[PDB]
Amino acid sequence: QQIDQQIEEENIRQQRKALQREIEDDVSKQREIKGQLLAEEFERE
Amino acid sequence: EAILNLELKTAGRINEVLNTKTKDQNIQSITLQAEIAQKRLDMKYKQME
């Protein structure tokens, strides 16, 4: 059982990664929007 | 030895992630400043015209 559970302890250490991807998405949003906004600056002028 | 490579697998993973998030944001910095430079064109050109 201890061997079985050292393995499971690592299986559990194996969601943070999916969130890291999600964090890259959060950047993409805002990055695109600021450039959207400079395009709007010309429109707004 | 196998235990120590667990810890330094983790260190590896962390460093991969740190550069991922650091450079994402540092590339965005500068990129959006470049967008401001781009803004100078388009912004002033509306009235320049």
Short mmCIF file of C-alpha atoms in Angstrom, two decimals:
data_model
loop_
_atom_site.label_atom_id
_atom_site.label_comp_id
_atom_site.label_asym_id
_atom_site.label_seq_id
_atom_site.Cartn_x
_atom_site.Cartn_y
_atom_site.Cartn_z
CA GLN A 1 0.00 0.00 0.00
CA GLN A 2 2.77 2.49 0.60
CA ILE A 3 4.21 1.88 -2.82
CA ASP A 4 0.75 2.12 -4.30
CA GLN A 5 0.28 5.40 -2.56
CA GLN A 6 3.67 6.90 -3.35
CA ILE A 7 2.56 6.37 -6.89
CA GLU A 8 -0.84 7.89 -6.24
CA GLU A 9 0.78 10.82 -4.42
CA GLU A 10 2.58 11.55 -7.64
CA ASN A 11 -0.56 10.89 -9.74
CA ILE A 12 -2.25 13.61 -7.76
CA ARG A 13 0.70 15.94 -8.18
CA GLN A 14 0.34 15.19 -11.89
CA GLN A 15 -5.26 21.84 -13.42
CA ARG A 16 -2.58 24.37 -12.82
CA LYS A 17 -1.43 23.72 -16.34
CA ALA A 18 -4.84 24.23 -17.81
CA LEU A 19 -5.08 27.46 -15.89
CA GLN A 20 -1.70 28.54 -17.21
CA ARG A 21 -3.14 28.11 -20.67
CA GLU A 22 -6.15 30.10 -19.50
CA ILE A 23 -3.81 32.84 -18.32
CA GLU A 24 -2.34 33.08 -21.80
CA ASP A 25 -5.89 33.55 -23.02
CA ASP A 26 -6.42 36.38 -20.61
CA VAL A 27 -3.40 38.13 -22.09
CA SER A 28 -4.57 37.52 -25.65
CA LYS A 29 -7.84 39.30 -24.92
CA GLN A 30 -6.44 42.37 -23.59
CA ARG A 31 -3.50 42.52 -25.97
CA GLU A 32 -5.81 42.41 -28.96
CA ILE A 33 -8.14 44.90 -27.41
CA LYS A 34 -5.50 47.54 -26.83
CA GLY A 35 -4.46 47.32 -30.45
CA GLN A 36 -8.16 47.37 -31.38
CA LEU A 37 -8.33 50.57 -29.45
CA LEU A 38 -5.52 52.32 -31.32
CA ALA A 39 -7.45 51.52 -34.46
CA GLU A 40 -10.41 53.08 -32.71
CA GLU A 41 -8.29 56.08 -31.81
CA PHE A 42 -8.09 56.90 -35.46
CA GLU A 43 -11.84 56.42 -35.81
CA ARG A 44 -12.53 58.46 -32.71
CA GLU A 45 -10.35 61.36 -34.06
CA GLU B 1 18.61 10.04 -6.65
CA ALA B 2 15.07 9.52 -8.06
CA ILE B 3 13.64 11.64 -5.32
CA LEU B 4 16.00 14.46 -6.10
CA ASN B 5 15.07 14.36 -9.74
CA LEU B 6 11.43 14.86 -8.66
CA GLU B 7 12.33 18.07 -6.98
CA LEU B 8 14.31 19.14 -10.00
CA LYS B 9 11.67 18.06 -12.33
CA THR B 10 9.50 20.48 -10.42
CA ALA B 11 12.15 23.21 -10.62
CA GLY B 12 12.29 22.66 -14.36
CA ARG B 13 8.51 22.93 -14.65
CA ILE B 14 8.50 26.08 -12.64
CA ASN B 15 11.14 27.73 -14.70
CA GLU B 16 9.31 26.82 -17.92
CA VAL B 17 6.21 28.45 -16.55
CA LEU B 18 8.04 31.49 -15.27
CA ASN B 19 9.41 32.29 -18.65
CA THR B 20 6.07 31.59 -20.22
CA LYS B 21 4.30 34.09 -18.10
CA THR B 22 7.14 36.54 -17.86
CA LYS B 23 7.86 36.78 -21.53
CA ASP B 24 4.17 36.78 -22.38
CA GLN B 25 3.80 39.90 -20.49
CA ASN B 26 7.15 41.41 -21.44
CA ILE B 27 6.50 40.80 -25.12
CA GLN B 28 3.04 42.35 -24.58
CA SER B 29 4.83 45.24 -22.99
CA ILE B 30 6.69 46.78 -25.88
CA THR B 31 4.10 45.27 -28.25
CA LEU B 32 1.44 47.54 -26.96
CA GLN B 33 3.90 50.39 -26.76
CA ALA B 34 4.55 49.63 -30.42
CA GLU B 35 0.80 49.79 -30.81
CA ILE B 36 0.97 53.24 -29.24
CA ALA B 37 3.60 54.14 -31.81
CA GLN B 38 1.19 52.75 -34.39
CA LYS B 39 -1.51 54.87 -32.74
CA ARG B 40 0.61 57.97 -33.52
CA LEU B 41 0.12 57.24 -37.20
CA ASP B 42 -3.40 56.57 -37.34
CA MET B 43 -4.49 58.95 -34.67
CA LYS B 44 -2.81 61.97 -36.11
CA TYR B 45 -3.45 60.97 -39.66
CA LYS B 46 -7.16 61.30 -39.22
CA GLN B 47 -6.72 64.99 -38.65
CA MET B 48 -3.68 65.34 -40.84
CA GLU B 49 -5.90 64.42 -43.73
#
